[PDB]
Design a protein around this ligand. Structure first.
Ligand SMILES: Cc1cc2nc3c(=O)[nH]c(=O)nc-3n(C[C@H](O)[C@H](O)[C@H](O)COP(=O)(O)O)c2cc1C
Length: 356
């Protein structure tokens, strides 16, 4: 019954439509992870999205490896995010901060410390640094003092997001970052209460989510999961046995909304033959369910008509179509995105894609 053009409530967040801007790392902050003024223009250009999910935003230096990505642990960062968020609100938009701990996906040259993870494992390929790509480093398996600290960092980051004026947060529990490295049995080789059976592998997600909810409210908390397909060396051998229970826990804790990134067999941002778990998750998580990856306008419209999702998040289309909702409403061709400038430092390929 819903179309992409119909409004939706994400908890108390009143979105004007169901065309979500997915989280996109762009690397237009400074080397100190403080947002830069150009980011205000980039997000204001995209304020017609029913909801913007920010680029992944580091909760701590330990968890933030991506060159020129922002953080939200410090008041300098909070003060720089304030005008960015204000410019979206002034255009009638809504925006949530995606809270990031990268886990084993960082390089020590950026963070100053060894990568941390569920287990002492190594991501495949090479990692981005300020001196170019380097081999990934084997992580260290976090202990109870580290868990306490990391929970504190999620708590503080969530508080700071609200302090900056964000409408809410999304916990980044996807794409082979720290939480995902606990969830999936390909990365989690722990012997303690955080390893082994699915309820143990969900425990870290549970504790992060509980601490964010206690800080800012369940109704202001969303989560992203990526249940299916290897992403950055992280895969589960039987994802339904951990991700359907994870989604149910989130439902029971009061989490306001859930986004699933789901590659398919012919996916163009990763691909996989692991089946998509959205149909099973839709039956256990009953609040707004946002799906993502490879959606066209007609596939998205059909998903909402068939009750498969309440909203769809678009990533690459929002890179090059700041006015994606208007282009869809008006049948205007979608401008191609320039992959060479996804992660570069310029305004080129960032704030210089025109609106219709
Ligand atoms: C340049 C770029 C940066 C991205 N950064 C993030 C990110 O910060 N957080 C995240 O959860 N996903 C990130 N993603 C994944 C997207 O949110 C999205 O899942 C992906 O682009 C597929 O959806 P699409 O087919 O609509 O583009 C990124 C994708 C791209 C292309």
């Amino acid at each position: 019954m819903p179309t992409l053009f119909d409004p939706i409530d994400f908890g108390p967040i009143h979105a004007k439509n169901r065309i979500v801007m997915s989280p996109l790392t762009r690397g237009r902050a400074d080397k100190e992870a403080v947002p830069a003024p150009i980011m205000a223009e980039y997000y204001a250009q995209r304020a017609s999205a029913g909801l913007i999910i920010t680029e992944a935003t580091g909760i701590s230096r330990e968890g933030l490896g991506w060159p020129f990505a922002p953080g939200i642990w410090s008041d300098a960062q909070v003060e720089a995010w304030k005008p960015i968020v204000a410019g979206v609100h002034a255009k009638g938009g809504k925006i949530v901060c995606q809270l990031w701990h990268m886990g084993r996906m960082v390089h020590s040259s950026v963070t100053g410390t060894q990568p941390v993870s569920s287990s002492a494992t190594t991501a495949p390929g090479e990692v981005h640094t300020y001196e170019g790509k380097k081999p990934f480093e084997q992580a260290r398996a976090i202990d109870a003092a580290d868990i306490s600290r990391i929970l504190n960092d999620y708590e503080n980051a969530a508080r700071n997001a609200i302090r900056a004026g964000f409408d809410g947060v999304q916990i980044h529990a996807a794409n082979g970052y720290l939480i995902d490295e606990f969830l999936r049995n390909g990365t989690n080789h722990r012997t303690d209460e955080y390893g082994g059976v699915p309820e143990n592998r969900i425990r870290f997600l549970k504790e992060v989510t509980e601490r964010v909810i206690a800080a800012i409210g369940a109704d202001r908390t969303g989560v992203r999961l990526s249940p299916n397909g290897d992403t950055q060396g992280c895969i589960d051998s039987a994802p339904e046995t951990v991700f359907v229970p994870a989604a149910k826990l989130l439902q029971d804790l009061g989490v306001a909304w859930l986004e699933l990134r789901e590659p398919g067999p012919n996916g163009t941002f990763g691909k996989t033959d692991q089946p998509k778990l959205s149909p099973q998750i839709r039956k256990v998580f009953l609040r707004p369910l946002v799906l993502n990856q490879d959606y066209t306008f007609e596939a998205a419209q059909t998903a909402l008509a068939e009750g498969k999702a309440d909203a769809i998040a678009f990533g690459r289309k929002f890179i090059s179509n700041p006015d994606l909702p208007e282009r869809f409403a008006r049948g205007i061709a979608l401008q191609p995105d320039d992959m060479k400038t996804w992660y570069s430092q310029g305004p080129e390929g960032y704030t210089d894609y025109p609106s219709a």
